[PDB]
Write a structure and sequence with these properties.
Elements (H helix, E strand, L loop, with lengths): L3 H8 L9 H4 L16 H26 L4 H17 L12 H11 L5 H17 L28 H26 L15 H31 L8 H4 L19 H4 L16 H4 L10 H6 L1 H23 L3 H19 L6 H10 L8 H25 L12 H28 L14 H27 L9 H7 L11
Helix pairs in contact: 3-4, 4-7, 7-8, 14-16, 14-17
Organism: Plasmodium falciparum (isolate NF54)
Protein name: Erythrocyte membrane protein 1
Length: 506
Amino acid sequence: EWNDVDMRDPYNKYKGVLIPPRRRQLCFSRIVRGPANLRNLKEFKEEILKGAQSEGKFLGNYYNEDKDKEKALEAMKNSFYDYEYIIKGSDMLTNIQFKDIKRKLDRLLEKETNNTEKVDDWWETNKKSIWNAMLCGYKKSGNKIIDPSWCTIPTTETPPQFLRWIKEWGTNVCIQKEEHKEYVKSKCSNVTNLGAQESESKNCTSEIKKYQEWSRKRSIQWEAISEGYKKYKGMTNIGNEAFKQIKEQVDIPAELENDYICNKYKNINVDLVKNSSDGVLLPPRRKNLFLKIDESDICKYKRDPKLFKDFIYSSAISEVERLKKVYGEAKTKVVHAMKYSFADIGSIIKGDDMENNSSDKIGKILGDGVGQNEKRKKWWDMNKYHIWESMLCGYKHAYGLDIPNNDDEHQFLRWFQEWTENFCTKRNELYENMVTACNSAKGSVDKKECTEACKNYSNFILIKKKEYQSLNSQYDMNYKETKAEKKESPEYFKDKCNGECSCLSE
């Protein structure tokens, strides 16, 4: 059981240390101390060896109790890490006299003012002895790295003790969280079927709710331990909120009744907007999209998908970098352009939209179908999340989080919505320019600047019909019998914005 107070009381240091439930209970065969005054260097070494052998035996018995495909190895490695910390603490731990008195007696008996190098070498010798305690054990008896007639794992080098403790705590907390998630997902897995009533399996939700609060108890506790580490360091989610929140799978029945990660983008480092249109218009981004065909990596994609993934990552990073440098400085228009680029990339990578090179690339990489891109959809979602995190890091570094639901809509419909938005922006800009140009001004015209001011707007409106013509063709795509119209087209345009379609379809 998670006994926070039970450890806090004897610790008397306020540190938030919580051992796992399996590592906490005990094996009672071991005795805290045997002989009272029968203490000698050789006798003390023998007693420590016996304790280590017994501990290994109980670890093996527990692993046999588990009998898991991979949990056994994780428990084995954690046991070695914990015992290594205990043996080579070389500092103050939660031991009354388990190490201090032994070290004092060893230093007093070995020689007058014995050095700590002798104790360190003795500890390393004990580690070697615990490694060799198998005594050429049979392959069947012990489970280790599988080799012909020799099932053993190589010795693991000891990293820094501070980093080693950080890693052990992280692995413990993670393993706990995956185990809790597996337990919650196993039971009450099916919620879509007969999930209208919460009382049918409400308990399961309560369980996750309990887990949720337990997760909270972890979070603060984790923070506490972090603080302690800050003191001792003296020389598929978006952020930490996901740890406190619960998976979306439970949201269906749950309806209401420091910067190390951010440095990965840096570690992985390495006129289009002002172009004027001259039967289908060319979008400013898709016209100069970075989708160059590389025939030198065609065979590599078939041989090692890893190279293809690395190429995809590099291309995405380069495209996002060039886009951010070419956007400008205005926050709102820059974010709108980023959303437009994201929609364009999602559409292109789905293999659904007039481009032959993209279709050939998709076919060569996987030979995708006409419109089946579920794996492509998930890949696009992951790439969008990665690009969003990279852009957040870039913006934070340049100037000192969750993706909005507006961009999460269908890419095909969002693409027309963003056309409507940019058309409205252009209309407003032209209106303001024409009002400011010569509105205050009044046979032959005296100022030639405004002779071509308003007319272009009409020509632009003519382009509108062309777009409307394309819109008409787009309507033909929606006019199809299958899902011909979920809700009326002009009213759909009006309601497709959260206040941004007031100037749209007016």
